[PDB]
Amino acid sequence: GMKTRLEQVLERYLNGREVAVWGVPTRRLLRALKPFKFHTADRVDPQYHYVVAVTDDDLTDFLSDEQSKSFQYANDYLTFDDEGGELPFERMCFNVPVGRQTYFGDGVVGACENGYIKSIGQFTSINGTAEIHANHQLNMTFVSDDIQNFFNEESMAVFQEKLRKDPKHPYAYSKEPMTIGSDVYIGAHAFINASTVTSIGDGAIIGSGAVVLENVPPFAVVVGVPARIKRYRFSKEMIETLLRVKWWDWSIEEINENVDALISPELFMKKYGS
Amino acid sequence: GMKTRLEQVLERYLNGREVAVWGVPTRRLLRALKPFKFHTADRVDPQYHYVVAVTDDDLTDFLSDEQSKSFQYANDYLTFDDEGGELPFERMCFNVPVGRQTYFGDGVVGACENGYIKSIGQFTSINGTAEIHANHQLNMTFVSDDIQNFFNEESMAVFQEKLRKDPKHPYAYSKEPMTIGSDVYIGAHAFINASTVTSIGDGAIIGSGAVVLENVPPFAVVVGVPARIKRYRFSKEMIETLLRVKWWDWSIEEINENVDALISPELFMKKYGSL
Amino acid sequence: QGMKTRLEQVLERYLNGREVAVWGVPTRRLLRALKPFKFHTADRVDPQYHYVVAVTDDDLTDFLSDEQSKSFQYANDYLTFDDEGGELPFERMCFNVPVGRQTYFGDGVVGACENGYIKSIGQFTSINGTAEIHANHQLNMTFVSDDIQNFFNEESMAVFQEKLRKDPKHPYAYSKEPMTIGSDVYIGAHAFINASTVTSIGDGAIIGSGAVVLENVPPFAVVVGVPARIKRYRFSKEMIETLLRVKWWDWSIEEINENVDALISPELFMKKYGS
Ligand SMILES: CC(C)(COP(=O)(O)OP(=O)(O)OC[C@H]1O[C@@H](n2cnc3c(N)ncnc32)[C@H](O)[C@@H]1OP(=O)(O)O)[C@@H](O)C(=O)NCCC(=O)NCCS
Ligand SMILES: CC(C)(COP(=O)(O)OP(=O)(O)OC[C@H]1O[C@@H](n2cnc3c(N)ncnc32)[C@H](O)[C@@H]1OP(=O)(O)O)[C@@H](O)C(=O)NCCC(=O)NCCS
Ligand SMILES: CC(C)(COP(=O)(O)OP(=O)(O)OC[C@H]1O[C@@H](n2cnc3c(N)ncnc32)[C@H](O)[C@@H]1OP(=O)(O)O)[C@@H](O)C(=O)NCCC(=O)NCCS
Ligand SMILES: NC[C@H]1O[C@H](O[C@H]2[C@H](O)[C@@H](O[C@H]3O[C@H](CO)[C@@H](O)[C@H](N)[C@H]3O)[C@H](N)C[C@@H]2N)[C@H](N)[C@@H](O)[C@@H]1O
Ligand SMILES: NC[C@H]1O[C@H](O[C@H]2[C@H](O)[C@@H](O[C@H]3O[C@H](CO)[C@@H](O)[C@H](N)[C@H]3O)[C@H](N)C[C@@H]2N)[C@H](N)[C@@H](O)[C@@H]1O
Ligand SMILES: NC[C@H]1O[C@H](O[C@H]2[C@H](O)[C@@H](O[C@H]3O[C@H](CO)[C@@H](O)[C@H](N)[C@H]3O)[C@H](N)C[C@@H]2N)[C@H](N)[C@@H](O)[C@@H]1O
Ligand SMILES: [Cl-]
């Protein structure tokens, strides 16, 4: 129903080639490949073939073969098992928009599937171990969720009605899915609570181990259990300039023309601050 | 003979059907499928077939397939590679009893296999990243465990004898394996120390990131590194009542008959006000 | 790669001209490692003629529960293909990284060896599989992303690398030594060590579960917390000094067994080696 990462890349780049499967195929992979022509990879030529590596180990083996030298990433090959891997173009993850050059792990892929995330910006870097989950209801006698597997139609109706009016947003009910900005960095073993967080601002840094229970302002650096603001990456004038310029939506050419201002915040302020 | 999750479900529900394997069969699967007829899934019909998706992606595929619309969870299908998934009936994980509708990840599966856990309650929800490990010996010149691979039988015997006497339970020696109660909730990146914890009480909530180094009282809410008690979910009076009522052992029929009391603590204390 | 996997180094050392019997579903990567050898799908296996390679841990568990495994000895006659961080009875390489005997860690630390963040990991060291070791990205530019560099032309890349190599805060662990992780070190679950700011986890160090380690851990220090702080040292300053000279973790196997009384009892260790 919803285009996988691989499905989006093939639409964009397969360009009528056949798919050369590198590695042991899976049922999920074969279903995704039914509309196209595909075969077990043997001799591969990027004029004729698109290489799908099934697992990361498959990709590792393929990138080690001399036959891969003529294949360029995403344009001519991809890994099937890496829904959170970044791409050179804006993509969808389970109906969540994800910007260019943004990566995350299966925890966040799940959070996208669970409806917890509104979007993830560009050039955002999320450690694979990050976790994003909602709270369960905290205003009933039980805290379990799978208890509802035992609920009949009537029990489940009252259960849902009280979830729906709970202002603490159990299961992120009746709140906005959170936006994760562009140029965000999230370190290892971090948690973001989907019941109380709607906003991880542009440029925000979430340090390793941080348990993030409330919104992170743009370009704030938060650490600790629970996450506290340690510092801001830039002055407020530089932050508001960054929020107006939005360099993370710049074209590739634009990124290179102004590389100097991207590596020097001082020149960035100088060029764009007024 | 320690039975997988899948074997326990097949024993209960297969009901003379044939197993239809949805996905690539692994050796762990074929060892588990030994007492049953099975084939590679092609056309399936829950009248003659119980479908075993091997991986999570296999189940995703199967459930995306139109042949699945007639298959009920656990009754007619299961994922083999999810030893921690919840079930509608009480089960074993490495001979550790697990209540109904309780789920957890591979780390807690590993804890069951390592012998760290006596039992896990009903309607308990444990994030898949939770870790439960014991301490190594802390009173020896060395802290390694795998050094013992180099011990000969006599060396190993003195090593084991000191371990068995250690009051601080390295490798959880000489202590009770821990209980995890019912209606327990454990967040992401949590840790429970198997050497120093014997019980996660009924109804406890363990916050994300919490490092749990001592017993968590029933219905306590613990957070932090290390975990400390921020509050209890219910009054002192309600906790005693809950511990007597034990709704988590109720029948499905009782859960629906008394759902009003499950949904409102206020009503629960009226209904069970005089025990 | 140019570089030998753990399995490649084990076969080189012990295969001894035998055929490889594959226990489990082979992978394309495994089949490439096995290419120069005669190999086959494990049916009946005999350690005189076969070396068993289990593909996954699940396969290893299966093999070791099969009666056919009784004759096979760890590493000498069988290994797991996909356990690059597992322990070995001899010192080995993980990518460019020396790793001592009976030392294990998980894929996070494997990745850290591949990234260039680790100089060496000592002997008899135990690292929980969830441990993470990563560096900081640049903190003195307009952006913090790394994959933005996938868009850099050659000129853009050059000014980017130029500034990075001048940064005294070591983004991507630039301009610093890769960290050494000592011998007889213990690292608990959900621990993090910052490769930008740490160059040394001393011998004997204990890093507790949940710790965020932002600076060097002295030898035999016990550190906990976010950020990690020293709770105690395992031994007195004089025994630490004695341990760092004796380096029992470099001892041979017979030495370990002859001196097991000193390894078990720090007090006897001291009377013997402390001068
Ligand atoms: C936040 C981060 C990116 C860099 O911030 P920084 O500028 O280096 O911060 P500093 O080193 O100046 O630290 C300043 C203060 O913040 C604290 N601090 C910084 N990072 C912290 C963290 N992750 N946890 C707890 N405290 C932290 C320091 O203890 C110090 O405290 P003090 O000021 O009270 O003495 C880094 O610490 C981090 O977490 N990077 C993650 C790397 C990683 O996880 N690897 C891969 C994941 S993708
Ligand atoms: C603990 C939890 C259940 C909610 O409890 P709560 O009482 O609503 O928490 P509140 O934020 O309202 O306030 C509780 C107090 O403890 C703190 N706190 C709450 N949760 C915390 C956590 N996980 N870690 C650290 N501190 C926490 C709050 O900051 C506040 O502290 P204060 O007294 O010093 O101001 C929830 O925050 C949580 O941790 N859920 C984890 C979600 C998850 O990981 N899911 C996976 C499982 S499948
Ligand atoms: C660090 C550790 C080894 C125990 O050390 P210890 O010498 O027993 O220290 P204790 O727990 O008795 O107490 C030391 C103090 O530090 C605190 N502390 C100890 N370990 C801590 C941890 N991991 N996190 C936070 N705080 C901790 C204690 O609360 C205690 O209180 P105090 O400072 O107020 O006195 C242990 O706690 C640990 O982390 N084990 C690892 C389990 C694991 O994850 N295993 C899998 C790996 S393969
Ligand atoms: N190699 C060194 C670099 O590694 C990390 O960044 C990497 C990610 O690791 C990688 O992600 C992949 O691996 C993750 C971890 O397993 C998975 O979650 C994810 N789905 C998967 O695509 C992205 N593709 C590319 C990105 N630059 C660090 N942040 C970075 O500082 C470090 O320099
Ligand atoms: N989907 C949305 C729900 O997700 C989580 O609950 C889920 C579990 O995640 C899932 O678990 C599975 O996935 C885990 C994560 O990989 C594995 O560890 C585990 N072994 C595996 O069975 C259980 N089967 C069903 C349970 N209700 C949240 N707690 C809940 O708030 C949220 O509403
Ligand atoms: N079984 C119980 C023992 O378990 C852990 O020690 C084990 C490691 O778990 C294991 O590691 C393996 O599993 C890890 C977890 O997935 C992977 O990261 C790793 N790559 C993989 O080789 C090593 N081989 C052996 C070591 N003794 C505890 N530390 C120890 O106190 C406990 O007694
Ligand atoms: Cl039952």
TrEMBL record, chain C:
Keywords: Metal-binding, Plasmid, Transferase
Organism encoding this protein: Staphylococcus aureus
Binding site residues for CoA 3: K169, Y186, A189, S209, K231, R232
NCBIfam families attached to this UniProt entry: amicyc_ac_ApmA
InterPro entries from the UniProt entry: Trans_hexapeptide_repeat, Trimer_LpxA-like_sf
UniProt KW Cytoplasm keyword: no
Record: residues binding CoA 1: N128, N136, Y186, I187, A189, S209, K231, R232
GN (gene name): apmA
Binding site for CoA 2: N136
PANTHER family noted in UniProt: ACETYLTRANSFERASE, ACETYLTRANSFERASE RV3034C-RELATED
Protein's UniProt name: Aminocyclitol acetyltransferase ApmA
Positions contributing to Mg(2+) binding: E254
Residues holding acetyl-CoA: N128, N136, Y186, A189, S209, K231, R232
Keyword field contains Metal-binding: yes
MF annotations from Gene Ontology: metal ion binding; transferase activity
